[PDB]
């Protein structure tokens, strides 16, 4: 009708496209993308994907690492589960056309060159120079566009899932499609399907500073909540420790792989401060390094700290970090000759919508894979290159559960249209924009790197003003990007803060002055609607 398919996939990064392909030979699939098909975090991925390929590494080692980096509450089934499947999934990417950097030289013959990053104990991250993401996204996209059973709809923003029991369909609660703002034609179209998969990315953008593209507004999570899904661990948001501090680096990350290959992290004065913090140094886990840099900033009153791989051969550097070199040069910084100014910024959402081994949420017919989800793999803190990994494995497992269910699926029934609201107000629309800035700022201050109970109350409080506020002035506003993004950020901020308030302890990326100590028995934080 308006739109019908077998499986609807909201999001076209690693998670969704790779899910797409797996399901394509036998299913009719629509992939949505809020902006052009390639703008998502996946495209901007640098460092690489973790797997275990060397005879010297082991799965066991990869598990342990993760369990460690995750500060004690990862879920082992998930981590193992997942640690035991990449390569395969990674291989599957390769079989799809992905070129990861070829070595030339174990001491006899040809291999995949591998890096490492913090918390890893052997060598295991397949990459493409320092721009893996490009290689990955570009390929997946290319195959998805050449596939008869996959339909990609760019610039199409989902607004909400259609849940049977909300539109007087009879039966148990089950998703049967979603309403989508068609950006180019400014209407909300109705889209039917037998299975919907959220693969929307993360929510880092609720914070004033981040590495992410402007899409990461967490719409997927908000949508799920609104539809009844439990969510978890949203207090565990990772601030990548090395983002660029330059007025013209709109938002810019210098991969951990730099440190993985020798880069140093320096104080504005030349000294290396990690040692004062963690014997693991430059390569300790991010919640820790990021806390350290935040500390030394506060302490010395410094705008920043520095990342330097100078002590290294200019030739290594430029072959391993082509993209970063070219881009720092254009701002007049030579990764080859000087320390680069860095600050911590919001990067990844370790929590999200709870989902089991196949990506199944709490709500029938609804899945969630990728960053938008919470599986248990990352516990309180993600280990570098486990994030792209998660997308693949769950794309996998989600394809296998789906293929089995599809055949016994209810028929594609007809659905109520969206009640296009239509009121306009040039001035009020400007305010929508003030609120965005307002949210992002206090989130940074009240639910940031160092936290306190009271600061959290301040966040909650402003969050509720914004919601009460939003309902009253906005409920009737003609939909538009700015507005949809705001409603969703706000929704998510709320869950981030409620989760942060529940954790009476400091663990992994949640650090509160009011509970410095580890509880003896802990777990995820879970909220259910
Ligand atoms: C700069 C950078 C470098 C990184 N490098 C690495 C790395 O080397 N290794 C690694 O493992 N991880 C890396 N990460 C983390 C990893 O990139 C992400 O966790 C992962 O790419 C998330 O992918 P995803 O498929 O879940 O969503 P994304 O790739 O971010 O895509 C989300 C998709 O959902 C669509 N969408 C969102 N909302 C809506 C909506 N409302 N309606 C319709 N469509 C919607 C978006 O438009 C987009 O298409 C990096 C992240 C960044 C930002
Ligand atoms: Cl990185
Ligand atoms: Na997640």
From Swiss-Prot:
The chemistry is similar to that of typical amino acid oxidases in which the transfer of the hydride from C2 of L-aspartate to FAD is rate-limiting and occurs in a concerted manner with respect to deprotonation of the alpha-amine. NadB may have structurally evolved from succinate dehydrogenase/fumarate reductase-type enzymes to gain the new functionality of oxidizing amino acids while retaining the ability to reduce fumarate. Binds 1 FAD per subunit. Pathway: Cofactor biosynthesis; NAD(+) biosynthesis; iminoaspartate from L-aspartate (oxidase route): step 1/1. The active site is at residue 286. Belongs to the FAD-dependent oxidoreductase 2 family. NadB subfamily. Keywords: Cytoplasm, FAD, Flavoprotein, Nucleotide-binding, Oxidoreductase, Pyridine nucleotide biosynthesis. Optimum temperature is 40 degrees Celsius. One of its GO terms (molecular function) is flavin adenine dinucleotide binding. Optimum pH is 8.0. It is an enzyme of class 1 (oxidoreductase). Changing residue 117 to A: Retains reduced benzyl viologen:fumarate oxidoreductase activity, with almost the same catalytic efficiency. Lacks L-aspartate:oxygen and L-aspartate:fumarate oxidoreductase activities. The record marks 117 as: Important in orienting the L-aspartate substrate. Changing residue 240 to S: 122-fold decrease in catalytic efficiency with oxygen as electron acceptor. 110-fold decrease in catalytic efficiency with fumarate as electron acceptor. Decreases FAD binding. Its EC number is 1.4.3.16, 1.5.99.-. One of its GO terms (biological process) is 'de novo' NAD biosynthetic process from L-aspartate. It holds the Pfam family FAD_binding_2. Catalyzes the oxidation of L-aspartate to iminoaspartate, the first step in the de novo biosynthesis of NAD(+). Can use either oxygen or fumarate as electron acceptors, which allows the enzyme to be functional under aerobic and anaerobic conditions. In vivo, fumarate is used under anaerobic conditions, and oxygen is the predominant electron acceptor under aerobic conditions due to the lower fumarate levels. In vitro, fumarate is a more efficient electron acceptor and is kinetically superior to oxygen. Inhibited by the product iminoaspartate. Competitively inhibited by mesotartrate. NAD acts as a competitive inhibitor to FAD. Inhibited by iodoacetic acid, diethylpyrocarbonate and tetranitromethane. It catalyses: L-aspartate + O2 = iminosuccinate + H2O2; fumarate + L-aspartate = iminosuccinate + succinate. This is L-aspartate oxidase. Succinate binds at residues 240, 255-256, 385. Disruption phenotype: Mutants lacking this gene generate 25% less H(2)O(2) than the parent strain. The lineage of its organism: Bacteria, Pseudomonadati, Pseudomonadota, Gammaproteobacteria, Enterobacterales. It is found in: Cytoplasm. The keyword Cytoplasm applies. FAD binds at residues 12-15, 34, 41-48, 157-158, 219, 371, 387-388.
């Amino acid at each position: 009708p308006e739109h019908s398919c077998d499986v609807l996939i909201i999001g076209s990064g690693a998670a969704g496209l790779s899910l797409a392909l797996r399901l394509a030979d036998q299913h009719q699939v629509i992939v949505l993308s809020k902006g052009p098909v390639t703008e998502g975090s996946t495209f901007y991925a640098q460092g690489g994907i973790a797997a275990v390929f060397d005879e010297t590494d082991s799965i066991d080692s990869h598990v342990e690492d993760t369990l460690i980096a995750g500060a004690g509450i990862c879920d082992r089934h998930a981590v193992e589960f997942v640690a035991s499947n990449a390569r395969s999934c990674v291989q599957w990417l390769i079989d799809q056309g992905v070129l990861f950097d070829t070595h030339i030289q174990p001491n006899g013959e040809e291999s995949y060159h591998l890096t490492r990053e913090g918390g890893h104990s052997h060598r295991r991250i397949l990459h493409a120079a320092d721009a893996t993401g490009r290689e990955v996204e570009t390929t997946l996209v290319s195959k998805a566009l050449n596939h008869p059973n996959i339909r990609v709809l760019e610039r199409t923003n989902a607004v909400d899932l259609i849940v049977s029991d909300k539109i007087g369909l009879p039966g148990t609660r089950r998703v049967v499609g979603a309403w989508v703002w068609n950006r180019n034609k400014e209407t909300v179209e109705t889209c039917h399907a037998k299975a919907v998969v959220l693969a929307t990315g993360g929510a880092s953008k609720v914070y004033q500073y981040t590495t992410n593209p402007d899409i990461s507004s967490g719409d997927g999570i908000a949508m799920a909540w609104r539809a009844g899904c439990r969510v978890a661990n949203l207090e565990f948001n990772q601030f990548h420790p090395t983002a660029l501090y330059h007025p013209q680096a709109r938002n810019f990350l210098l991969t951990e792989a730099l440190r993985g290959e020798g880069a140093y992290l320096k104080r504005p004065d030349g000294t290396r401060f990690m040692p004062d913090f963690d014997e693991r140094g430059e390569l300790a886990p991010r919640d820790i390094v990021a806390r350290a840099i935040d500390h030394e900033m506060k302490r010395l009153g410094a705008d920043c700290m520095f990342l330097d791989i100078s002590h290294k051969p200019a030739d290594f550097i430029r072959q391993h970090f082509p993209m970063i070199y070219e881009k720092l040069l254009g701002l007049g910084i030579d990764l080859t000759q000087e320390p680069v100014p860095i600050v911590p910024a919001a990067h990844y959402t370790c929590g999200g919508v709870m989902v089991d081994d196949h990506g199944r949420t709490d709500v029938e017919g609804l899945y969630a894979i990728g960053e938008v989800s919470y599986t248990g793999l990352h516990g309180a803190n993600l280990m570098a290159s486990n994030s792209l990994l998660e997308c693949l494995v769950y794309g996998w497992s989600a394809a296998e559960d789906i293929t089995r269910r599809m055949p016994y699926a209810h028929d594609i029934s007809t659905l109520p249209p969206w009640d296009e609201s239509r009121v306009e107000n040039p001035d009020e629309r400007v305010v929508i924009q003030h609120n965005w800035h307002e949210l992002r700022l206090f989130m940074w201050d009240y639910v940031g790197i160092v936290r306190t109970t009271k600061r959290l109350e301040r966040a909650l409080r402003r969050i509720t003003m914004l919601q009460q506020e939003i309902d009253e002035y906005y409920a009737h506003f003609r939909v538009s990007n700015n507005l949809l993004e705001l409603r969703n950020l706000v929704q998510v901020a709320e869950l981030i803060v409620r989760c942060a308030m529940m954790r009476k302890e400091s663990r992994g990326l949640h650090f509160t002055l009011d509970y410095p100590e580890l509880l003896t028995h802990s777990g995820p934080s879970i909220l259910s609607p």
